[PDB]
Structure 1
Amino acid sequence: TYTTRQIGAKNTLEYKVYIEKDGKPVSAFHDIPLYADKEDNIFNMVVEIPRWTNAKLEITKEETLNPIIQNTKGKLRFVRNCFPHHGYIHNYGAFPQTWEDPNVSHPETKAVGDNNPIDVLQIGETIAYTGQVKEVKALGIMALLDEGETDWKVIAIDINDPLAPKLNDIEDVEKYFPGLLRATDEWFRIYKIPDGKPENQFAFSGEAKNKKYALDIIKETHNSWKQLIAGKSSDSKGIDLTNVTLPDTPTYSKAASDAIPPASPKADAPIDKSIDKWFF
């Protein structure tokens, strides 16, 4: 996408993240393709959860979509610091341009699909870029069945980062990052534990596929989101489609950019000392 605007905050509850594309705002999940960068190579992705971070920000329902500190009980959602590890490790992306239809769950995914786009986790040597739009190639794919919701795990890396031609499938890692697998598997369950959510239960007995399953899963991810733009296609379009990158959608308001107020970066808001808590 390019650069983004920092809406001063980081927790408070006003920190509005807005990524900008070239010369003007943008829109993740919409104004963010994917199969870009050597169609026969990989694609770009967005970030909204740097490693070692108890914070969790998303992007949906706002206009152009943007990460945030999800709420629910009037307050920022801080992910527990599970004993093993720290806060949030893996980074997190969200191959924007896709949508996990709640219904349609393909074979081997009863929990059908969900709302939020797709979850992507890249093990890039460098930290995250809370909205940092960097490239990366898909490796393996992980699936997690939680609260009747078809969840999947994508493996992407900074194609530009070292270990490029080194990682091109699941097998690898084990040799390079032999401990990133099972390390991710659980960490997810307990992720809900200290919060009111016991375990989850990974799909496929608990095994993940390779890029083959990723590319496909990632492919049928955009299409499901593409065949949606159409207009009414989806019988349930609860979100902002508006896209100035598709003059073929009754939502091409290329004027929804200037409207976006200029960035207002303030300062990282202090986080309750409750976080940094190793929940065993």
Structure 2
Amino acid sequence: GFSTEERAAPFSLEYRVFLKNEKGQYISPFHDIPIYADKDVFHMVVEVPRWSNAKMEIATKDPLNPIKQDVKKGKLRYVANLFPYKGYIWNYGAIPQTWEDPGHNDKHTGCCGDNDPIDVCEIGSKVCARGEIIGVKVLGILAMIDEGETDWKVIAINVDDPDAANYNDINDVKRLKPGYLEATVDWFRRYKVPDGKPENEFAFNAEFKDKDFAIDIIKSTHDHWKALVTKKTNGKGISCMNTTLSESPFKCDPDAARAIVDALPPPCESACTVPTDVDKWFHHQK
């Protein structure tokens, strides 16, 4: 359904991954990819493949949401290998046309939105690619508190997984992939510890909520997103520019999108070398 246009070399500061539809029009992965792929099937924008380390995400404040690599203190960011794990333990990404409005306090957690699309942890066997669009069955949700803010972690599976029919709610994950949900909480708890930050906290005693609860949350975030691109709520720095939303004042001609991408350095097929330190293991007393 979709394709990728990459500017500059992977793992440089200039690297940008833009999205294209079937006709070759540049689109925002944040705004132009429909939340649903089919009945009961959500789209997922894949940001980081399982077992990779580069911290890539949809650029919420840059025109045309590209996916790009996070930076702190001037350095390209890579997540730790938290022993016994290698990098990211699932395919990781966002559900498009979702937004955690920072104006909205969540009732269950008491905190406000983090201003980002809702995050998804995809648990299937296939290792997906950066920028790939897939369809997923939602299974459950985790409520992490990320520095005072509500940060939902949706648990899901690629609808095209050979075993996908066996997974319909969160209990199937406990049953068919034991230790997995436990590892997920552990990972999100400790992932910033090697950066000299404390562990993260969770609502609901770091328990997972089921499918229906997850889908309720996702629906709300989609309604908040509706308000965003339709200009009935303060955008708050977010770039709403899009290429397909008829009902949006922020819609733009495909050639204006083209002008943005072309100002950027050309596609460089050869990735930069990932620093050697990234391969290090971070152990801890358990």
Give yes or no for TM over 0.5: yes
CA RMSD of aligned residues (A): 1.5
Partner of 1:2: 2
Q: Is the 8 A contact 2:5 2:18 kept in 1?
A: yes
Partner of 1:113: 113
The DSSP-based 3-state class of the residue aligned with 1:160 is coil
The DSSP-based 3-state class of the residue aligned with 2:81 is coil
Partner of 1:30: 31
Q: Please state if 1:159 is matched with 2:159.
A: yes
The DSSP-based 3-state class of the residue aligned with 2:228 is helix
Partner of 1:148: 148
Shift of 1:61: 1.5
Matched residues, number: 277
The DSSP-based 3-state class of the residue aligned with 1:47 is strand
Look up the equivalent residue of 1:187 and give its one-letter code: W
- Structure with bigger helix share is 2
Shift of 1:268: 1.7
Q: Give TM-score scaled by structure 2 length.
A: 0.92
Matches within 5 A, 1:224-239: 224-231=224-231, 233-239=232-238
* Unpaired segments ≥5 residues, structure 1: none
* Unpaired segments ≥5 residues, structure 2: none
Residue number among 265, 277, 280 corresponding to 2:280 in the alignment = 277
d(CA) in 2 for partners of 1:275, 1:186: 20
Partner of 1:182: 182
Q: Is the 8 A contact 1:8 1:265 kept in 2?
A: yes
Partner of 1:21: 21
Q: Give TM-score scaled by structure 1 length.
A: 0.94
Partner of 2:52: 53
- Structure with bigger strand share is 2
Q: Is the 8 A contact 1:100 1:118 kept in 2?
A: yes
Look up the equivalent residue of 2:125 and give its one-letter code: E
Which digits, 9 at most, give the CA deviation of each residue in 1:66-114, with x for residues without a partner?
Answer: 2211113111011111112111111112001111112322211212211
Q: Is the 8 A contact 1:94 1:118 kept in 2?
A: yes
Q: 1:90 to 1:144 in 2, by over 3 A?
A: same
Q: Is the 8 A contact 1:105 1:111 kept in 2?
A: yes
Partner of 2:249: 250
Shift of 1:245: 1.1
Shift of 1:265: 3.4
d(CA) in 2 for partners of 1:143, 1:84: 24
Runs of 4+ in 1 over 3 A off after TM superposition: none
d(CA) in 1 for partners of 2:57, 2:93: 10
d(CA) in 1 for partners of 2:75, 2:273: 14
d(CA) in 2 for partners of 1:162, 1:36: 18
d(CA) in 2 for partners of 1:156, 1:206: 17
